[PDB]
């Protein structure tokens, strides 16, 4: 009843309703997906073309942290940009202190602490974004998803946004059918296919597909967008 009007107020059942409302805000965004392959990660996202006056291939959504971390988010885009700026500051501080690129689990913990710190007071608002991020470090490839409550986990495949249910079903089938794993290019094709399938929930507007990847054998452990013939091949595979 009255327990939903302020952040960091426990309900009688032990709930924080402002965080749940932030999750509701997240559920109204576009679909973002991440796939973990044998030696890297692939991030894919759908961008709605509200008007034909939007310049194609501009308005980039996927963002980069340091030179090896990829991040995408669903929800209120400015909140995601705020979180990415904070993550860039954290990575810079870690690199300055310890002369090594920040490991992915450490970056995930720093982001989680920052998100969680916004559920502790009623003078601030929880972040309205769910973030799928990851990359490659000395231990290998890592993929994580972070929720508005500050909780995060590592995933074999993650999906968020309005079309999250169908994307999760497709990811589960993909994981079940490939116990050994997937290559980076095959992961790019599958991400294109899954984004196209998940868009079928929202047929009212056209969409553009954006894909990025970070792999040891394809980008030498750096994060790079997919823009050339590979992007067209993935689009053709998805539309097939």
């Amino acid at each position: 009843t009255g327990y939903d009007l302020s952040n960091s107020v426990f309900s009688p059942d032990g709930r924080n309703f402002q965080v749940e409302y932030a999750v509701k805000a997240v559920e109204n965004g576009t679909t973002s997906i991440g796939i973990k392959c044998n030696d890297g990660v692939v991030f894919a996202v759908e961008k709605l073309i509200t008007s034909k006056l939007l310049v194609p291939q501009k308005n980039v959504k996927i963002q980069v942290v340091d030179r090896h971390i990829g991040c995408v988010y669903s929800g209120l885009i400015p909140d995601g940009r705020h979180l990415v700026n904070r993550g860039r500051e954290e990575a810079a501080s870690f690199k300055k202190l310890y002369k090594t690129p920040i490991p992915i689990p450490a970056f995930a913990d720093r982001l989680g602490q920052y998100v969680q710190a916004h559920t502790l007071y009623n003078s601030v608002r929880p972040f309205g974004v769910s973030t799928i991020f990851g990359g490659v470090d000395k231990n290998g490839a890592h993929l994580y998803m972070l929720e508005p409550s500050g909780s995060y986990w590592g995933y074999k495949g993650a999906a968020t946004g309005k079309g999250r249910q169908s994307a999760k079903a497709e990811l589960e089938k993909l994981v079940d059918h490939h116990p050994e794993g997937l290559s980076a290019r095959e992961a790019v094709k599958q991400a294109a296919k899954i984004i196209y399938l998940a868009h079928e929930d929202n047929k009212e507007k056209d969409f553009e597909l954006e894909i990025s990847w970070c792999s040891l054998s394809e980008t030498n452990g750096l994060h790079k967008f997919v823009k050339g013939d590979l992007l067209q091949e993935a689009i053709d595979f998805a539309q097939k």
Partner: protein, 232 residues
């Protein structure tokens, strides 16, 4: 920095018709002790810029960290980072000069002298100098410290005016640079026989040569020198 401890020697550079050439030795000296061998003092920032640093080695490493941070920050939210939005030698020099002058104004200088060399996007050569006081200047040939007394007179023989730049080929410029390095090894007591060189050309790419050694020297006539004055 109030007093340098580990220091590198001069860096020399010149412009030719198509690009720029820069060079520096690989020695870090510790108060008349030739302590560290294998110190790279030329830092390539991208594909169109090389920064050559002389003076305190710790401040040089700090500057290298700053340059890497600048590249990383430029790459953020910039799909044209490998395109018309890439960093340029002018940007890098302006940033470095701002840092040097601000730190001088706080009585906490970076005890260094820096030459930035490269090629702009339009193809024009870039070569400029800034020191620990923030003093900046440009010339067809540049050198700091000891080289400024011995390398500049030789290099100005090849390129004496701005009009001589189009006449100077890369081969002549590189030969002049190598000869200047040999002269410095002859007469500079804080110098090393091993050095590195970098060529930035508008048509071809950046060429970074390491492990270059001063070649055949003239020492035979020393056998003719007897004792001072009247001996023998």
């Amino acid at each position: 920095t109030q007093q340098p401890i580990v220091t590198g020697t001069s860096v020399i550079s010149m412009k030719y018709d198509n690009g720029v050439i820069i060079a520096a030795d690989n020695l870090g000296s510790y108060g008349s002790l030739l302590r560290f061998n294998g110190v790279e003092r030329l830092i390539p920032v991208g594909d169109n810029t090389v920064v050559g640093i002389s003076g305190d080695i710790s401040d040089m490493q700090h500057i290298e960290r700053l340059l890497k941070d600048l590249v990383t920050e430029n790459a953020y939210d910039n799909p044209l980072a490998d395109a018309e939005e890439a960093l340029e030698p002018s940007y890098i020099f302006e940033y470095l000069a701002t840092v040097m002058y601000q730190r001088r104004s706080k009585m906490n200088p970076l005890w260094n002298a820096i030459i930035v060399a490269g090629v702009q996007s339009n193809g024009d050569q870039f070569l400029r100098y800034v020191n620990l006081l923030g003093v900046t200047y440009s010339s067809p040939t540049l050198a700091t410290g000891f080289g400024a007394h011995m390398a500049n007179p030789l290099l100005r023989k090849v390129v004496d005016r701005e009009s001589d730049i189009p006449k100077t080929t890369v081969q002549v410029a590189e030969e002049a640079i190598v000869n200047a390095m040999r002269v410095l090894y002859y007469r500079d007591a804080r110098s090393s026989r091993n050095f590195s060189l970098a060529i930035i050309d508008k048509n071809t790419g950046l060429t970074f040569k390491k492990n270059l050694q001063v070649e055949n020297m003239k020492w035979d006539f020393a056998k003719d020198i007897k004792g001072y004055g009247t001996q023998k």
